[PDB]
């Protein structure tokens, strides 16, 4: 693509909006930023020549522009932008802007669950390989950040919103991983909006990976499937062992792998399946499963003491997520379950099944906090923050009993982002949860 000459917007900024300003001046091309929020992220690291408008959308710059760069953070329903593409002006977003340029084959992951997961392994497994691999998008660094004429494997996290706007991914793989009620707010024509914006990612791509357990991954009208009891790449169960299969074939007991759970079983068969169609050889890619250790706010153990387990799953920003977390948790004493946040116009209903029996509680927060405690009010308590949660159920841990932040929410009503909920949940119970 040749941008030369044109006028450039880009809506939002932060290191994404960053990294797009700076591919633009990197090709001699000055472009102009704006985004709603008067003091965005990154505002004092853009060089004042590139002229800004925070605080609000202008129309008369997007109006006025050749080609709109639009952060995944804003609509394409967004009146402002309907109005430009009704008028033939071209919108796109970081990831198509990178697509143009990629000169290695991309290997692209989206899903409502496990796409961070899956994105990393086939990272690792590309790494083992002795592959120069970048590894980002919707995670770890922006895709532009990770162009690089050396790179010899993308591995891209994509999200729904970034499949909007993107057009000329031409994967080497893709995989949808599953589709739960998710981003609502954002999708007003419902389950079957969201679905169709992740579908998308199929268009174009050599080799198409579905989850034969969920048929919304399909497209509407030859993919390779993964799946528990059926699929191309399944799971084998042998009394108290589980193994990896391929077409019938053990390729790994799982009791090698660092990671455990059902859905982080068919999570490694996905990143295997895209792997495989990578063309990564198949003992390094098996490799990289044993090694992993799983990521910062998945599920992860930050104090086991005094014989209670705090687990940070601050990841889990949707109700698909949590239910994760749940089925099939073995708790020994007492579940403490903090939920709440922003839940993005979520049903949470579907969690109510697991939370029956007199062995759960629950400690409800943030601005969905009052719809999570009514999902079973007579064990329930509501704060406004999650602080006042943790403080509140700390005297009553037991030994033997679990404290859970699962959210089914995103962070952003109260926190920088989820890392930075499991960073505060985290240090909370190294002080609640010692003498
Ligand atoms: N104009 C403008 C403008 C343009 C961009 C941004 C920000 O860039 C983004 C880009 C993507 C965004 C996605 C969402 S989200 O509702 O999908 N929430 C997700 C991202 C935040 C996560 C967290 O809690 O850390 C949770 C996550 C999710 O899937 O729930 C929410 C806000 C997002 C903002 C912005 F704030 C303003
Ligand atoms: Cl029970």
Redesign the pocket.
């Given at each position: 693509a040749d941008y030369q000459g044109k006028n450039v917007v880009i809506?939002?900024?932060?290191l994404?909006?960053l990294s797009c300003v700076d591919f633009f001046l990197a090709r001699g091309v000055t472009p102009r930023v704006?985004?709603?929020?008067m003091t965005?992220?990154g505002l004092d690291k853009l060089p004042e020549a590139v002229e800004r408008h925070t605080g609000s959308?202008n129309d008369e710059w997007l109006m006025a522009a050749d080609l709109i760069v639009?952060?995944?953070?804003?609509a394409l329903a967004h009146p402002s932008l309907s109005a430009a593409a009704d008028a033939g002006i071209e919108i796109v977003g970081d990831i198509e802007l990178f697509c143009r340029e990629a000169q290695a084959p991309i290997v692209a992951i989206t899903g409502s669950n496990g796409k961070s997961t899956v994105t990393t392994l086939v990272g690792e497994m590309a790494k083992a390989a002795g592959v120069n691999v970048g590894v980002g998008g919707?995670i770890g660094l922006p895709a532009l950040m990770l162009l690089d004429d050396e790179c010899e494997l993308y591995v891209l996290e994509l999200?729904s919103?970034q499949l909007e706007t993107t057009s000329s991914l031409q994967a080497v793989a893709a995989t949808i991983l599953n589709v739960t009620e998710?981003?609502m707010?954002?999708y007003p024509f419902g389950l079957q909006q969201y679905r169709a914006a992740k579908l998308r990612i199929y268009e174009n791509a050599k080799v198409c990976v579905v989850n034969a357990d969920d048929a919304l991954t399909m497209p509407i009208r030859r993919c390779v499937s993964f799946g528990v009891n059926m699929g191309d790449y399944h799971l084998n169960h042998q009394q108290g062992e589980t193994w990896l299969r391929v077409k019938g074939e053990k390729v790994l007991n799982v009791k090698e792998m660092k990671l455990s759970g059902q859905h982080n079983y068919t999570n490694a068969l996905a990143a295997l399946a895209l792997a495989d169609a990578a063309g990564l050889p198949r003992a390094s890619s098996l490799k990289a499963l044993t090694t992993f250790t799983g990521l910062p706010h998945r599920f992860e153990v930050v104090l086991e003491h005094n014989g209670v387990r705090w687990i940070n799953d601050?990841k889990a920003?949707?109700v698909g997520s949590t239910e994760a977390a749940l089925n099939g948790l073995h708790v020994d004493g007492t579940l403490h379950l903090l939920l709440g946040?922003?839940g993005?116009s979520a049903d949470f209903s579907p969690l109510a099944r697991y939370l029956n029996g007199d062995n759960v509680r629950l400690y409800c927060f943030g601005r969905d906090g009052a719809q999570l405690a009514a999902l079973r009010p007579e064990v329930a308590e509501q704060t406004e923050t999650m602080e006042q949660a943790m403080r509140l159920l700390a005297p009553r841990v037991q030994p033997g009993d679990m404290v859970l932040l699962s959210p089914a929410?995103?962070?952003?009503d109260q926190?920088?982002?989820?890392?930075?909920?499991g960073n505060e949940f985290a240090r909370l119970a190294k002080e609640l949860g010692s003498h």
């Open positions: 809506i939002g900024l932060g994404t909006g704006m985004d709603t929020r965005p992220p959308l639009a952060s995944p953070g804003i919707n999200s919103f998710d981003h707010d954002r601050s920003t949707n946040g922003d993005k929410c995103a962070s952003l926190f920088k982002n989820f890392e930075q909920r």
